[PDB]
Structure 1
Amino acid sequence: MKEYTLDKAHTDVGFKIKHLQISNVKGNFKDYSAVIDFDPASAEFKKLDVTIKIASVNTENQTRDNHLQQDDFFKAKKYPDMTFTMKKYEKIDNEKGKMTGTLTIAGVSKDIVLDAEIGGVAKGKDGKEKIGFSLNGKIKRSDFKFATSTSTITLSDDINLCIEVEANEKE
C-alpha cells in the first residue's frame, strides 16, 4: 500500500435524510362581489350574498394559483365562481352572531355556519354609515368532494375561512 492524508478543502463527509414539514397555505381572492344588508339599530344581517371569481385566487405563489384552476382542484373552466348565500343570521349580542348559509364550490352546495364578529359599527366622518366585521368557520374538503384526488394526509381536509370586511353605505 501507501498512505494518504485528506485534502479537507475537497473532501465532504456528507449525508441526506428526508423529513416532513407542516405549514399553513394562506390565500385570498382579488376579484369578488358582495351584496350586504345590515341594520345598525339591531346589529342584524338581513342579506349577505357573495360571489368570488376562482380565477383570482392568490396564495402568494404564481404556479400554485395556476394549478388551483386545474381539473383536480377548482376546475375553473367549468365552475368559474364560488358563492355564499346567507340563509339566516341568529344574533348573540351586538358583537357576535351565528350566520348560516349555502356555500357552493365547483357546483357542489352545502349549508355552513360562520361566526360573525362585529368589529365596529359607526356613522363616518361624513355622516354616512360604515361597518367592520369578520366571518369565520372551518369547512371540510370532503363535504364538498373537493380536490378528491389529493389525500387528506398531504393537504388537510379542513379549510379555515376568514372573511374580513370593511364596508360603507350605498348610493
Structure 2
Amino acid sequence: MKEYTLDKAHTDVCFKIKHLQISNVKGNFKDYSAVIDFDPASAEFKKLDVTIKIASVNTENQTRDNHLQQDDFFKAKKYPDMTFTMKKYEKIDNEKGKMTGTLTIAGVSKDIVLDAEIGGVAKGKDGKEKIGFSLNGKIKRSDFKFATSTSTITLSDDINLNIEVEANEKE
C-alpha cells in the first residue's frame, strides 16, 4: 500500500435526505363582479350574488395560475366562471350573521355557510353610503368533486375563503 492525507479543499463529506414541508397556497382573483343588497337599518343582507372569472386567478406565481385552468383543476375552457348566490341571511347581531348560499365550481353546486362580519356602515364624505364587511368560511374540495386526481394528502381537502369588501351605494 501507500498512505494519503486528504486535501480538505477538494474533499466533501456530503448527505441528502428527503423531508416534507406543509405550506399555505394563498391566492385571490383579479376579475369578479357582485350584486349587493343590504339594509343598514336592520343590518341584514337581502341579495348577494358573486361571479368570479376563473381565468383571473392569482397565486403570486404565473406558471401555477395557468396550471389551475387545466383539466385536473378548473377546466376554465368549459367552465370560465365560478358563482355564489345567497339563499338566506340569518342575523346573529348587528355585526354578525350566518350567510347560506349556492356555490358553483366547474359546474358543480353545493350550499355553503359563510360567516358575515359587518365592519362599519358609514355614510362616506360625499353624503353617499358605504359599507365594509367580510365573508369567511371553509369548503371541502371533495364536496365539489374538485381536483379529484390530486389526493387529499398532497393538497388539503379544505379550502378557506376570506372575502374582504368595501362597497358604495348605487346611481
Displacement after TM superposition at 1:28 (Å): 0.5
Secondary structure at the counterpart of residue 142 of structure 1 = helix
Contiguous gaps of at least 5 residues in structure 2:
none
**Cα shift at 1:160:** 0.4
Provide Cα deviations, 1:79-125, integer angstroms capped at 9, x if missing partner: 00000000010011010000000000000000000000011110011
Deviation (angstroms), 1:54? 0.1
Higher strand share: 2
Secondary structure of the structure 2 residue equivalent to 1:147: coil
2:15 & 2:163 partners in 1: Cα distance?
Answer: 45
Distance 1:163 1:7 in 2: 60
1:159 Cα deviation from its structure 2 partner: 0.3
Alignment of 1:13-162 (within 5 A): 13-162=13-162
Deviation at 1:19, TM superposition (A): 0.2
CA distance in 2, matches of 1:124, 1:62: 37
CA distance in 1, matches of 2:35, 2:72: 30
Q: Secondary structure at the match of 1:122?
A: coil
Shift of 1:70: 0.2
Partner Cα distance (1:20, 1:14) in 2: 20
Moved more, 48-57 or 1-10: 1-10
The structure 1 segments of at least 4 consecutive aligned residues displaced by more than 6 Å after TM superposition are none
Shift, 1:2, TM fit = 1.0
Over the aligned positions, Cα root-mean-square deviation in angstroms equals 0.5
Structure 1 unaligned segments of length 5 or more: list them: none
Find the residue that maps to 2:51 and give its secondary structure.
strand
Q: CA deviation at 1:7?
A: 1.1
- Once the 2 structures are TM-superposed, how far is the Cα of residue 154 of structure 1 from its aligned partner? 0.2
Question: How many positions carry a matched residue from both structures?
Answer: 171
Say which SS state the counterpart of residue 63 (structure 2) adopts. helix
Deviation at 1:43, TM superposition (A): 0.4
TM-score (norm 2): 0.99
1:65 counterpart SS class:
helix
Q: Which whole-Å deviations, capped at 9, do the CAs of 1:4-53 have from their partners, x for residues lacking one? A: 11111111100000000000000000000001000111101000000000
Give the whole-Å Cα distance in 2 for the aligned partners of 1:39 and 1:124: 16
